[PDB]
Amino acid sequence: REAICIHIGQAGCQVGNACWELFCLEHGIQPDGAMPSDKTIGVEDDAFNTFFSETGAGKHVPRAVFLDLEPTVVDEVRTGTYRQLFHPEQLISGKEDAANNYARGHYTIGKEIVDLCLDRIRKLADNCTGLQGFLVYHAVGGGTGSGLGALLLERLSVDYGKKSKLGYTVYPSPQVSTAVVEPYNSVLSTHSLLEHTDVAAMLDNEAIYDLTRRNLDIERPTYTNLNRLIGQVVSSLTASLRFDGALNVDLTEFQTNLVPYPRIHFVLTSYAPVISAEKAYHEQLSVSEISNAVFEPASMMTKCDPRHGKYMACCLMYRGDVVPKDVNAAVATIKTKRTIQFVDWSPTGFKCGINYQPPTVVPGGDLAKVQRAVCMIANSTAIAEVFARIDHKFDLMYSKRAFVHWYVGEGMEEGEFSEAREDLAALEKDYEEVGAESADMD
Amino acid sequence: REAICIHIGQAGCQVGNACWELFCLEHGIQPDGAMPSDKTIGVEDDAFNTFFSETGAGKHVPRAVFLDLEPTVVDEVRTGTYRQLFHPEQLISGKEDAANNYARGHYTIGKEIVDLCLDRIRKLADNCTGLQGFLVYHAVGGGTGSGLGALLLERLSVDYGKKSKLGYTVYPSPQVSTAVVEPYNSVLSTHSLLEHTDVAAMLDNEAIYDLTRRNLDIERPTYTNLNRLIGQVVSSLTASLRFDGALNVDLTEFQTNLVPYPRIHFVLTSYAPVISAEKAYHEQLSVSEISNAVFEPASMMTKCDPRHGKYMACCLMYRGDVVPKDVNAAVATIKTKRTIQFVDWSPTGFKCGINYQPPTVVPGGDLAKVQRAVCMIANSTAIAEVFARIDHKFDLMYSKRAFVHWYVGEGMEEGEFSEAREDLAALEKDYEEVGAESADMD
Amino acid sequence: LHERLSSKISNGFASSAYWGATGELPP
Amino acid sequence: KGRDPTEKELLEVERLYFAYADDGAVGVVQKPHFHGPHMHVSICNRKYVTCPNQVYRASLPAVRNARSRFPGPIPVWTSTKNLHAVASNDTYRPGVHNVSKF
Amino acid sequence: REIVCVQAGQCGNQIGSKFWEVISDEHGVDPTGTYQGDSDLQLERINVYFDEATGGRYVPRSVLIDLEPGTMDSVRAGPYGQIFRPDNFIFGQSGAGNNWAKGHYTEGAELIDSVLDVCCKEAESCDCLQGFQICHSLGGGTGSGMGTLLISKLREQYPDRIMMTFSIIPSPKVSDTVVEPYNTTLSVHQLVENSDESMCIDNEALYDICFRTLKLTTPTFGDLNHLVSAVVSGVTCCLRFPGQLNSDLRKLAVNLVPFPRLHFFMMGFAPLTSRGSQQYRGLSVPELTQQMFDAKNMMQAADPRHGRYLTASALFRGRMSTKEVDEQMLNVQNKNSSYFIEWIPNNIKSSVCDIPPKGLKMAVTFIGNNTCIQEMFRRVGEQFTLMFRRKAFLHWYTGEGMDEMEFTEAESNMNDLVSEYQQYQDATIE
Amino acid sequence: REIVCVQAGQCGNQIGSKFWEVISDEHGVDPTGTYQGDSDLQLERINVYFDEATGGRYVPRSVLIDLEPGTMDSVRAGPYGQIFRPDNFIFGQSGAGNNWAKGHYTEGAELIDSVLDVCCKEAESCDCLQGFQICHSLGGGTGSGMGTLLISKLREQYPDRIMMTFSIIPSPKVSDTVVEPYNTTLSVHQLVENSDESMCIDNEALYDICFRTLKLTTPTFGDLNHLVSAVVSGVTCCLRFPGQLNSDLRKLAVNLVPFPRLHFFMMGFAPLTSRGSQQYRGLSVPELTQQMFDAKNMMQAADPRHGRYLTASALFRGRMSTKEVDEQMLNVQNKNSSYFIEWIPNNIKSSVCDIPPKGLKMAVTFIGNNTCIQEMFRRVGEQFTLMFRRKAFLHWYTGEGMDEMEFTEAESNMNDLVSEYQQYQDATIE
Amino acid sequence: RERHAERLSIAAEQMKQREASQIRKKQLDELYTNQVDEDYFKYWDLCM
Ligand SMILES: Nc1nc2c(ncn2[C@@H]2O[C@H](COP(=O)(O)OP(=O)(O)OP(=O)(O)O)[C@@H](O)[C@H]2O)c(=O)[nH]1
Ligand SMILES: Nc1nc2c(ncn2[C@@H]2O[C@H](COP(=O)(O)OP(=O)(O)OP(=O)(O)O)[C@@H](O)[C@H]2O)c(=O)[nH]1
Numbered sequence A, B: 001r002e003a004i005c006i007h008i009g010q011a012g013c014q015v016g017n018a019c020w021e022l023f024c025l026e027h028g029i030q031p032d033g034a035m036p037s038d039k040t041i042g043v044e045d046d047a048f049n050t051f052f053s054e055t056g057a058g059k060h061v062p063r064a065v066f067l068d069l070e071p072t073v074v075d076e077v078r079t080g081t082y083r084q085l086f087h088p089e090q091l092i093s094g095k096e097d098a099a100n101n102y103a104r105g106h107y108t109i110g111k112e113i114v115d116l117c118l119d120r121i122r123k124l125a126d127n128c129t130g131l132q133g134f135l136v137y138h139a140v141g142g143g144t145g146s147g148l149g150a151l152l153l154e155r156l157s158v159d160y161g162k163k164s165k166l167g168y169t170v171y172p173s174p175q176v177s178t179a180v181v182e183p184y185n186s187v188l189s190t191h192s193l194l195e196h197t198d199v200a201a202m203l204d205n206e207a208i209y210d211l212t213r214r215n216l217d218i219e220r221p222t223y224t225n226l227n228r229l230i231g232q233v234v235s236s237l238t239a240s241l242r243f244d245g246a247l248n249v250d251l252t253e254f255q256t257n258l259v260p261y262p263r264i265h266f267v268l269t270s271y272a273p274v275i276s277a278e279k280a281y282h283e284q285l286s287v288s289e290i291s292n293a294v295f296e297p298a299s300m301m302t303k304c305d306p307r308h309g310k311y312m313a314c315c316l317m318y319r320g321d322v323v324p325k326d327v328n329a330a331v332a333t334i335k336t337k338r339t340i341q342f343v344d345w346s347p348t349g350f351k352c353g354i355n356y357q358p359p360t361v362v363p364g365g366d367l368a369k370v371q372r373a374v375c376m377i378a379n380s381t382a383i384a385e386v387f388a389r390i391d392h393k394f395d396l397m398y399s400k401r402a403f404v405h406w407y408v409g410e411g412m413e414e415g416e417f418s419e420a421r422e423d424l425a426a427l428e429k430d431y432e433e434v435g436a437e438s439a440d441m442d
Numbered sequence C: 001l002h003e004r005l006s007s008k009i010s011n012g013f014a015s016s017a018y019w020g021a022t023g024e025l026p027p
Numbered sequence D: 001k002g003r004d005p006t007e008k009e010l011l012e013v014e015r016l017y018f019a020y021a022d023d024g025a026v027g028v029v030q031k032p033h034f035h036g037p038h039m040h041v042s043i044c045n046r047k048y049v050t051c052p053n054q055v056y057r058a059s060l061p062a063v064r065n066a067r068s069r070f071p072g073p074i075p076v077w078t079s080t081k082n083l084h085a086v087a088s089n090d091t092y093r094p095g096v097h098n099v100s101k102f
Numbered sequence E, F: 001r002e003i004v005c006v007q008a009g010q011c012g013n014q015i016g017s018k019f020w021e022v023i024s025d026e027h028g029v030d031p032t033g034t035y036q037g038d039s040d041l042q043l044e045r046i047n048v049y050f051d052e053a054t055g056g057r058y059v060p061r062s063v064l065i066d067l068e069p070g071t072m073d074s075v076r077a078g079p080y081g082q083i084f085r086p087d088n089f090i091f092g093q094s095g096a097g098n099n100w101a102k103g104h105y106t107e108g109a110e111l112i113d114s115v116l117d118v119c120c121k122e123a124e125s126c127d128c129l130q131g132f133q134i135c136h137s138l139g140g141g142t143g144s145g146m147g148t149l150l151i152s153k154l155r156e157q158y159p160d161r162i163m164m165t166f167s168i169i170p171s172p173k174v175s176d177t178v179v180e181p182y183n184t185t186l187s188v189h190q191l192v193e194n195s196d197e198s199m200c201i202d203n204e205a206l207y208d209i210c211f212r213t214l215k216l217t218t219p220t221f222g223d224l225n226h227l228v229s230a231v232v233s234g235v236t237c238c239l240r241f242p243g244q245l246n247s248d249l250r251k252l253a254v255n256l257v258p259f260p261r262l263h264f265f266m267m268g269f270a271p272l273t274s275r276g277s278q279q280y281r282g283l284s285v286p287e288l289t290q291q292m293f294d295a296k297n298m299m300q301a302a303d304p305r306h307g308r309y310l311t312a313s314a315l316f317r318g319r320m321s322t323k324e325v326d327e328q329m330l331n332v333q334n335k336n337s338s339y340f341i342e343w344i345p346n347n348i349k350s351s352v353c354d355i356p357p358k359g360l361k362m363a364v365t366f367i368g369n370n371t372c373i374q375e376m377f378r379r380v381g382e383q384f385t386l387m388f389r390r391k392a393f394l395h396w397y398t399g400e401g402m403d404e405m406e407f408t409e410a411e412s413n414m415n416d417l418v419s420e421y422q423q424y425q426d427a428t429i430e
Numbered sequence G: 001r002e003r004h005a006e007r008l009s010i011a012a013e014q015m016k017q018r019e020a021s022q023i024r025k026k027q028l029d030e031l032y033t034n035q036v037d038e039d040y041f042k043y044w045d046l047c048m
């Protein structure tokens, strides 16, 4: 039933604004925390309970924390439109940033703030009766997102134990870039993240820019568009908890179905009817068409091509007016294709979910209104290329010790670079070896 | 049931405008794509489905793609009268033309554009349940039509396999000419077309100009007249799929009846009651008169005389108010003629078709209104003369390597000229060998 | 005379692929 | 042509630029490209430092200093002998000889 | 598909001023830069020659270069001069002195970096760049030296695009300057290597056009530059308006040039007729076809009757039938077979465009590749050999720094161009 | 996050006066100190540059230091002079005499304790202190000597903060004083040890900006100081207003400096254009980026084309799409790839801020770390070697008390800085 | 019949969204173009 959201740094807070806008508008909570219940349904309703708690006077308050080291974005949230929705203790802000240094976030500054975060999360978790996981939003390219996200996930993993942790992660894009030191922070993040996360979903801004140019008709997209797409994806995945349906899917089902070996937990994500109103009105949008859509690499929100690898597992979420026979016919058609390949040790490649609630339309939004949608998360060996290019860029800089004095001054041993780079080399070899056919190994 | 139309370059898009105008007017779809609401017929007809698909709100959209390398013609279609009919994805336009270079279309530019075209065609083929062939319109005289048409037909032939591919092709006229380098592009196109097309129909503008001068009373014809004639021919051939009749003819029947050996697949086409309104009232137009008309060389749409060769197979399509007994009596009278000769290995020379739907009348058109029409496609050895003349033109220029540096600069080996010219020489010898009587060889 | 020549310059801007096309359906 | 070339016709070897193909054949570059960076234009624009059409080795051409002249209409340039002396158009042109690799 | 213009020297800047007047008239752009046109067809391709400046305004994508600012103050003072961007005017301080070596080596290298910076600024702003267009005279000083210098730099930087030049060459009959042969010879040597396609115009041919065909009582250099601006704006018309059979500069080059050195072309424009005669003859495709091939209407002193056509191209503007174009080109090709090079089976390309220039029902521009162009270069070489044998004015060029071997290079290159044309003229099938 | 500014000597005091005019304008502070602004966005970060005194008024956290009071009376006479706290002006009674040793050792040590006392009083009042910002010239006397003295003392007392300097250095072409090389060499020796990040400006480059780009008819030192005040106020804009991608001085340092000695940077600001020309070209992100990398718009005499970029940073102000910023910065990195150091895979950081500088809808400031800065230091070292070999003026410095060994140490340290830049400037194919 | 009517209503809603999106696109394009006023040139050419 309940889930707690943790938003870290700039990308995570900005994506949080779009997420909470959507969850408010879909459930019907006013920006000041109220529910104008006007229906004659006779008995009350509970779908909000996953994301909101009531005090008793009927105000709603949400199950989230916003964590940042710089004040500006959280103070912008404090002064914005949703001022009265959040509890002021939930919005935590430090004085100064981690300056794109993972070492500064992890060792120097995040170590002071981290205990307040755990006290707030504990205070939330005590006001629950069926918590079934954490959703975490952060970017691994920046200093506080990497350092404090890793430190906080380590502490959470010790304190809460078996509870599942599902990450939505913005990785450094393969040729658009915003800062020089992105490879060092991403390598060190991935080193910490390997041990302490159950499924990690990867996003690249370059892919969502391509998708918004190609599918939507937007010449000049900005982060609010990308954040609204991410919010739609998270709403699709969590809808199985919140509304009636034929085949529900609990958050624990993802980890069991998607991860074959404990290091192989990085998944690709795509969403089908990303479409403009003029295209939406030029075409019918049947189940088989959107099922065909989720497998094209042009639909993905991460810049990787799955045609350079083999699929290991697929998880397909359908929401809206869909019938199981059409899902079966679609999946059988996908299975027929010759350019779609599964590893020979994974014969039963699919997990299905079917929910009746269609996706909500946001007043200022750019997506069309549609009767049905499908969302996919999938595990594929093609992902090894993302690590290989990050590792190549790391090798290029570290071969000349390009920036190391900053990291050593802010508290990190030089040895940590070699350890992390060797761990990522072993991860590359794992993805190379797992993809080797069984007939060759006798 | 379904057929997909592919329009390439300038001639193919302009002929497409006339074709889709005709198919709309024949079925009754309005320019905005909605059936008229004033009619109260009560029945809910589906015959359009061969060429249109419905979304569900009742708009119609057509099963076609328009492919060009220059923007201007496709932007004219986008801004024209049928703007709202087409889905915008179907109208594909590049930045710059193939500049009358087959090499530029095939190697440099079409190789870049071809994957978008293949993805659109795939998206069409996924929305079918009884696809029974591709119709392709292009000219082999220009650079993008030859190079990208060949490359795309080759890719279609690998991807779709056994499915039939029928081409409507504009060959270089024997004295009307538009560009200097036409022989090179036509030879290099034809080299690819031998392997990768099931039937190819050839058209020459000089013949349609002669036909519009002699039969119609038009002193100053232009391409819109020719394109309306071509549209009528395509409507006659595809009418067998769409309306009730005595003897239907599926698109797969053409290849079985017309092609004796796998290289001998180029056929001549003609159409009978091309007549003006003032002549139409001086003359009756019975079955036997139009059957006698289709055999005169003044009726042909390619500048060749079939009296210089021997027929192997003929396919006669009758549409309108015709009775089989009159078709049989006419064909037996034609068979009696002394200037019509069949090869002795082909005793049963004829295929017949009979459809009840008379030809549609277009408000601005130049053909008279007639109750019946017949259209013929036939295979004959006279066709060897067209290739022989394109060869001398190629040989005269190639003797001095007159333009080859353009082709070599745009990516082609000089060897490819000699290979194609030797293959066409072998095709000439094939037409000599196939036509020799068996009684002479004992 | 002047108005006729002034009107004679407006009609020089026209395209030829959809010349006279209207799209009305015969019943 | 069926004949072998004569000594006079073999002088054409000097006037042409030769190169190897990828498979080992010997050919002639019709239109050589600049040995510095240049443009190949397609559906997208791109800069190539090296391309197979180049004849000589790739190199970065020297450029003239942008701030060589005085900030004004007066005719004063920087000297060619050192980095601080000045010169004018008296008996020589100092603006044409300010090109340097670094 | 954007064109960048370069205007060099007095002749180039004046022709450019008339060209941008003609183009601004055709698209209905006011001399303040405001769009005032009356059909969307005018607006939808305005980007081809104009860039859009803020709140309404349009600016023309042209670079003006000259060695003495005398001309620049005159063009700024002209009726359309305000439209030009102030930063686009590049000028020196001392003159070219009518000397090629001075224009190429001393003041050339001084200015050339700022012109290349402006040309790069203009080129990199286009979303897709089509060829450059350059107007200059070959007989002058800054025109010849800096034009060929800039052409060489742009050819280094954009080798895959098109390079187009319009060039004025000294009359054998009415020269304005004594040292014309040196400047012409060195410039043609540069052009035959660098250019993809080059058009040549004789002022004597424009005078004969004006006096015999137009019967002008008192022609001026403005009329000659108006004829040139008319053809220049005509060649690009199919790039920027719809039509039944589109054509393009690259398609022209592919159909016109058989071998890369044979890229020198003749020019003509057909609907020319005096105000007294205009009441007597309506426009039609036969009239345009007869005038287009009439040597009275061709802009070079060499006449087609002494040579043979390798290739030709005709671009028609207006609402007209394709049948008449095809049948006219067929009838001329069949009836005139001796004037066409026989080892090419069809020499003429046709093209048809829907949109005529305002106030004309129809127009055609003719481009011809004819071997009789060899006679002009031979004549220039004769005047050069007369001057060079006696070292008549050579100390100026040698004082700038040239080795005498440069003059022998230019003579050898021009002689080889004449020889190559003469050899292809007398080739045979055997 | 509060910044403390220090302005030293006449040049520093004049630039400071123009800076505080620009900053007071952006936050709507009346010259009486009263807030008269029109949006809450102005108030919420006013603390960054102003401290609040009671009953509304705000006073600017700045220390004014000079050795002769002439400038202080001039700044008190200026239009904004009243805003400054009276106790913050520290001055002596006799000039520096254009001598580094005089400014550093004899009159320096007498005053320096009162300056440190004021700076500590100002620093300990902040709730959280950001780096210091210092403006001074290196060629002068009190600017060089007392600026570097104060920098050393503040770096001892606040080693965990940022130390940032903007510094003007004498042109080889347009100098006001004969003994400039000694003062420059000793100051660069002090800075390379003491500074965290140092920006260098040539008055010659600002004159070329004004004359070529702005076409000013009669420039004055006020214009030069406005260009400097524009870049200085632009660098801090993301500290004090909201935006889509925040940035900070420390974040700039972390991305710009690969190794601790390589901390000298070039500056530029893009939207510069004369009032006559501005009507002809609208501002846009491609235009700002193109001007931003154009060496015409860079504030030093050394040209980037003779070196290679290790790193660069661009800070954008205004309402704009992130896609255009990202794709433009990618396109510039791809198109000029030979000028970027190849062992760093992506050299550019971008940042976006919502609030532009007053009277422009959008602006960008550029900070660049380029090896061509070595040419400036080499030139100063050359002039020093000419003077030092002949003992040209050393008795003044030795009479103040300097050891010649100080001069040899400073020369050696600058020569090693030049060598470190020189190894990275040139390619090594091996 | 009920299902068909529901589909028609959704199509009408899509038409309305199309119109709103066109208006918003025009407004954003107007917002993103740059402009200059007199505060730009205030500090230059004073000769003080
Ligand atoms: N999709 C998306 N990407 C963002 C957003 N905000 C920042 N990014 C990207 O994430 C990376 C920057 O990470 P930041 O979140 O700014 O880093 P940080 O967490 O603030 O870390 P510090 O800079 O030390 O405070 C860049 O690649 C940005 O393009 C956002 O709102 N949406
Ligand atoms: N019947 C008919 N013939 C046409 C039409 N358009 C062009 N042609 C002929 O086809 C040949 C020209 O081929 P194009 O279609 O223009 O060549 P393209 O496909 O555009 O190739 P590119 O020029 O490289 O773009 C000439 O023989 C024309 O006469 C048309 O609409 N109808």
Ligand SMILES: Nc1nc2c(ncn2[C@@H]2O[C@H](COP(=O)(O)OP(=O)(O)O)[C@@H](O)[C@H]2O)c(=O)[nH]1
Binding pocket: E008, E009, E010, E011, E012, E014, E015, E096, E098, E137, E139, E140, E141, E142, E143, E144, E168, E170, E175, E176, E203, E221, E222, E224, E225
């Ligand atoms: N057709 C034409 N010729 C011109 C024009 N102006 C100058 N000329 C000719 O060009 C030659 C002079 O060259 P010029 O342009 O002055 O050379 P520059 O000094 O290098 O610019 C002479 O033959 C002039 O007759 C003009 O506006 N039109």
Ligand SMILES: Nc1nc2c(ncn2[C@@H]2O[C@H](COP(=O)(O)OP(=O)(O)O)[C@@H](O)[C@H]2O)c(=O)[nH]1
Binding pocket: F008, F009, F010, F011, F012, F014, F015, F096, F137, F139, F140, F141, F142, F143, F144, F168, F170, F175, F176, F203, F221, F224, F225
């Ligand atoms: N840009 C600028 N330069 C200045 C200003 N005042 C002086 N200078 C320059 O700085 C040098 C003189 O240094 P100065 O400031 O007098 O040194 P000080 O005596 O120690 O303060 C000369 O090159 C002057 O041209 C100013 O207000 N702005």
Ligand SMILES: [Mg+2]
Binding pocket: A009, A010, A070, A097, A142, A144, F246
């Ligand atoms: Mg941050």
Ligand SMILES: [Mg+2]
Binding pocket: B009, B010, B070, B097, B142, B144, E246
């Ligand atoms: Mg074409």
